[PDB]
Nucleic acid binder design. Structure first.
Length: 42
DNA sequence: TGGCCTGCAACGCGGGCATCCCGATGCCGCCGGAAGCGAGAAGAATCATAAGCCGTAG
């Protein structure tokens, strides 16, 4: 079973990765100014 | 408190007029010296191209 797929999966995965990195990795919050790594460590 | 400005009377010589000599000057012919325009060459400068570090991620 080899279903034919469109190239748009590239852009979809890129958008998903960009959203994930922007939300949960890089940008801290304004209520405490702490990264999720620092949060988990504390 | 001391010096500049000015009225006044007496001494002084320069301005005004006449004139012949002199030196600048316009003109003409002749000789020369920057010039300036374009063109070629040199230096000065701002735009365009390849990471490096910052800290997590694989």
């Amino acid at each position: 079973i080899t279903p034919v797929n469109i190239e748009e999966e590239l852009k979809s995965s890129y958008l998903d990765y960009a959203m994930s990195v922007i939300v949960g990795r890089a940008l801290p919050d304004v209520r405490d100014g702490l990264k999720p790594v620092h949060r988990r460590v504390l």
